[PDB]
Amino acid sequence: YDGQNCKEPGNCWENKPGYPEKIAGSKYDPKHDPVELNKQEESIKAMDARNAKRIANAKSSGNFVFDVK
Amino acid sequence: YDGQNCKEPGNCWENKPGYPEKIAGSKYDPKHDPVELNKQEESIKAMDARNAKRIANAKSSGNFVFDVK
Amino acid sequence: DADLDKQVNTAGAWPIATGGYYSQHNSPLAQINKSNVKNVKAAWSFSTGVLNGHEGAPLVIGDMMYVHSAFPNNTYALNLNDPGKIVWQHKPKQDASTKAVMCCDVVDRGLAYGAGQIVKKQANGHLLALDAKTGKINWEVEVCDPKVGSTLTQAPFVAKDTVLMGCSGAELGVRGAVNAFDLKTGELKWRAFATGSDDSVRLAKDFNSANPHYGQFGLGTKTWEGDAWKIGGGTNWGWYAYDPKLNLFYYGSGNPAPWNETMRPGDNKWTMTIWGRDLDTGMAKWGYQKTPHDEWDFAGVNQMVLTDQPVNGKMTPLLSHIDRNGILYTLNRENGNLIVAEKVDPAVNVFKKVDLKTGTPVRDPEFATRMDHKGTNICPSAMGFHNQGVDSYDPESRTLYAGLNHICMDWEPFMLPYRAGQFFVGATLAMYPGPNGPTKKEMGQIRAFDLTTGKAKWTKWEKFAAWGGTLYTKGGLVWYATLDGYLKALDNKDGKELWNFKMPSGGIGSPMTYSFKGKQYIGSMYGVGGWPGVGLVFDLTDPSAGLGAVGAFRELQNHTQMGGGLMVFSL
Amino acid sequence: DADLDKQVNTAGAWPIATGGYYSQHNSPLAQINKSNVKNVKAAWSFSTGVLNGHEGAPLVIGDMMYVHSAFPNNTYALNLNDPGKIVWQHKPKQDASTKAVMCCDVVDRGLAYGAGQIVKKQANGHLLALDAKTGKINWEVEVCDPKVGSTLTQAPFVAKDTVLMGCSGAELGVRGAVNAFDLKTGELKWRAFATGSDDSVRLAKDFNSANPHYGQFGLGTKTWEGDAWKIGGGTNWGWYAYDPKLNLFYYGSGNPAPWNETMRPGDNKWTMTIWGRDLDTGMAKWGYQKTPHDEWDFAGVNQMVLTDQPVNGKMTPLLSHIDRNGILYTLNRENGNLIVAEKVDPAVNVFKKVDLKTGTPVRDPEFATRMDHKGTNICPSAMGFHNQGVDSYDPESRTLYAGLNHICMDWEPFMLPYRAGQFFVGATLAMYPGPNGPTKKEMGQIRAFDLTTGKAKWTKWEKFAAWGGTLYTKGGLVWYATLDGYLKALDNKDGKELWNFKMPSGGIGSPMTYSFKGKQYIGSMYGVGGWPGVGLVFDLTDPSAGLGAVGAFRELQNHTQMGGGLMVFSL
Ligand SMILES: O=C(O)c1cc(C(=O)O)c2c(n1)C(=O)C(=O)c1cc(C(=O)O)[nH]c1-2
Ligand SMILES: O=C(O)c1cc(C(=O)O)c2c(n1)C(=O)C(=O)c1cc(C(=O)O)[nH]c1-2
Ligand SMILES: [Ca+2]
Ligand SMILES: [Ca+2]
Prior knowledge:
The complex is a heterotetramer, with two copies of chain A and two copies of chain C.
Chain A: H1 34-59
Chain C: H1 2-8, E1 26-27, E2 41-47, E3 59-61, E4 64-68, E5 75-79, E6 86-90, E7 112-114, E8 117-121, E9 126-131, E10 137-142, E11 157-159, E12 162-166, E13 177-182, E14 188-193, H2 198-201, H3 219-222, E15 241-243, E16 248-252, E17 273-278, E18 284-289, E19 305-311, E20 314-322, E21 327-332, E22 338-343, E23 351-355, E24 360-363, E25 375-378, E26 392-394, E27 399-405, E28 407-413, E29 427-433, E30 444-449, E31 456-462, E32 471-473, E33 477-481, E34 486-491, E35 497-502, E36 512-516, E37 519-526, H4 534-538, H5 549-552, E38 565-570
Parallel strand pairs in C: 1-32
Antiparallel strand pairs in C: 2-38, 3-4, 4-5, 5-6, 7-8, 8-9, 9-10, 11-12, 12-13, 13-14, 15-16, 16-17, 17-18, 19-20, 20-21, 21-22, 23-24, 25-28, 26-27, 27-30, 28-29, 30-31, 32-33, 33-34, 34-35, 36-37, 37-38
One pyrroloquinoline quinone binds next to loops of chain D.
């Protein structure tokens, strides 16, 4: 794995001698938990709605408040 | 109570108008708990013992060490 | 904005962390010069009352100075007419747990200024705009969430009516994005992730059109197996640069997660890449990945320096940057063409070199990292040959004065799960000084470079890493702070030491300069910390602790202690 | 001991916190004078890595400087040849609960030196002797017990082969005592209590033979009702003085407990007493009770200054002292005779005056304290017209330069139980500026006194209390640090301000001076705290909080933040 063998342009990755080409099903399988994976997304969704809630309850009053709800 | 009327040398205390001459039994009785009042002496006593063990413990070997028993 | 444009155009002001839009971190002030320097003396000081790493430098806007501290990220406004009085201060109420999801000290790289407001963040993810004269809070929004290990540490960046902010957390497996807010109201404009779909990443239809071999569409997921990119890293916690003409802003995206390479096959795009994005839409114009499939934690966030220099005797718009990987890169800031890609020190061995044709690092297997194998004598170390510091540029001699680390490592990875809000490193290291120091002991250098040739003019060695950066003032001096506690002034010509002063604590920021009532002052933060000072800051004794950093910096302890504040100097 | 006297007699050394055995806290160095003081600049700095008030000053022996911090009491050794490096350091392991029993910030007034040993204490009750060269511990013993509310803060005092040390805690009912320890072994020689039997108080056969009216035998039991003396206070946490010819040592014992005067009828002897005790036996030769039955917390621990001056033409061995009560006292140090007992400011109202014949204060009932009553416009406040500061004396003009406080209060006691290890105060106060400041907001003054008449030569006003003291150097300057952060230099002649520097934080110690390779230096700790700064170091807001102090120093925050360090100056 020298970085010069590219399947496609910008995709030159290769497994190291002795390592799977695909991680799943092997002893190196991360076995990631889906719900755990989505945690960041859910977080952004929430916080995003909080800020719209924050900035909206201000464009109308004239006075900004963070402790919105 | 001006500080100038002394019972004897070095003892010039006087009760202020309307305050009792002796506190015990009055509305200002501190009602001190003897068990509480003796703590400092007991503590000192114990401390003295530990320290005496340390200087001896090292006067005989020649290497100070705090931990003793 | 027009307000910042005004400040940027005023002599002696310092409204931008990096020195200006181009981030050359220099100054035309020449009242202090090589003939003078010996007489510079302390003028006044200020304690923040917080310990830990004091990164960044204060902002000077008019007769006001703005100082910032480590967590809990307090703000102090001082009128230069009487440094003794604190006009307004902002002191956040932040949960103390925030601290536990921060990898490399509870640092803060600084403030930003725009539209007569101070743009400031908080480690716990809040971002705010405060009036600059009263400190009244104009708006307050949430950018990051510490419960998923995401925090703020970089300085906000302001250009036109936009503030750019990126969260930290790749060591906790956080998926990097550059967030854009409205200066005036703090409402989100757009978000550009480092991994994912073309839509999340925001590539324009002409993305890399001039360099198709760099890669284009869909690499965001194909260079990853499954949803591994969802906790893929690539956070941008470094510095920005901006080209008002082109209306493009540039920055590096960080390391892929976990540190354990065998857990994430693929090129891991678009982490470790230098970007060219339209300020208004955030759509990528060009993007070049410096370290495809990272194996060493070379988070590619370092400073971007924009210059206008002759290349092959023709004038070209360049972008320059010294990566953690140990390569100095020079590209055309217009279309992303690769012009220079040289090793900052011959000690670099992860790559044989970087092929300008393939635009790829020619990897050396002997110095790679993989499961069941302990890599040894890998250079650079994870701390890199260059970190978070801001370097300067002398526009006359066309020289960049770099603060480099000379540190190597030992590395062996290990498997571990992922829990949203916990550390996700998966590697055990040992760090030590590189091999080229004059006594095989030095860990720092101030090296001067030609950006178009990538060649070094001179070198000044330092006992410890040159972490903070350098500043360049037209008087012919290169100013820097050291981990062991001194502020030094070198002769730009040969790097010989003209002056120094022993500060309370080592410095982890870069000096700044300003003018007040016709007098030039040099400003510096003090209060050692950051990755280098974790042993000293948390009381670590384990060499392996602090991600391998503790062993390396064992001796710092006998040279300095914690601190937190500012010192100003002048004639 | 012999080693101490060697250092005492070596020019430009500083082996005693107080300046010498006589505690005049002055110096013969005349390199810096009224004519070149303008030129003094910061020479070097060092951070302790700890916050909270940094009281005291460093010690200089040979080419070594020993610096100390606030709790947890670290010690750092520096060769003056190279301030950048920490030769040795001592960092104790102390339980954080220790802090909960320290009344007035977690402060430490400094180190001592004797027999080639650095003597240091810990807030938690230990006292050690460490090699001055290597920091190796020679002996370590317990002095006080934090479990009953006893902690250590004062600077140890060394004289001959003995080390004097007293614990703090009158605010928690601690019965004060001076403890004398063997310099070489740390074994206890004796202990002289401030209350109880004459045997425990250690009175000599001829105690007060020249002034029988001061009181003699049986009063440490007889001036209390029952057993109240057992938790009677009288701790000595101030400064000491020593006359080698006379073999006497001098010091003041503190305030009686509780603060609630109604709970302890009696003169409460021998608290609030100035002592003349034999160094080898610890037996009192004389004892002058300044404040019989304290009703204001006027703890009598202030510095004792020995001078030899003519009184009515007769050269007399004197002891001078400014108590919390607002009275400047001058006695004959051999016999305890009272010569001067004068107000340091006309605002003193607790007493009409001190009767030199009766030797007691003539009380003004209007400013007394007592249950079920709120006393207002009491001057001085609990904080006193003088506190822990270390003042200086010019042997040539024969003037003492005092740092005073100008604070008054309102007070009203309340009944409470005594439980060991728990606070035992019983008073609510509000403190505020005294009446004489120019704008009526000033709470500090630098006042120059004649010790034989107790008359002021000049006055300098200060916004904030003059808490740390002053230093006098033969060049004709009075040096001091302010709570708002400046080290200043005045003309000893008229108190006019000749120089100043803004340090990172407020100073609560007194400046020191030494020689090194032919240059005189001025050293000053920085880092606000102590009683005046508790609002700031603890983030209190209740004006009533911090024993009344918070309301009084509420504006200190707009001028300074915490710190921790040393700043050295020179030409
Ligand atoms: O992966 C990240 O998101 C992230 C964040 C930070 C940070 O914000 O301080 C650092 C790093 N990585 C990092 O790799 C690193 O070497 C580092 C050094 C420092 C520092 O301030 O000195 N921060 C960080
Ligand atoms: O009664 C005591 O035992 C005791 C101890 C201390 C101390 O050790 O700091 C102070 C006081 N009292 C005290 O009354 C006082 O006003 C005070 C001020 C300070 C300080 O350093 O600022 N310490 C103390
Ligand atoms: Ca990282
Ligand atoms: Ca007290």
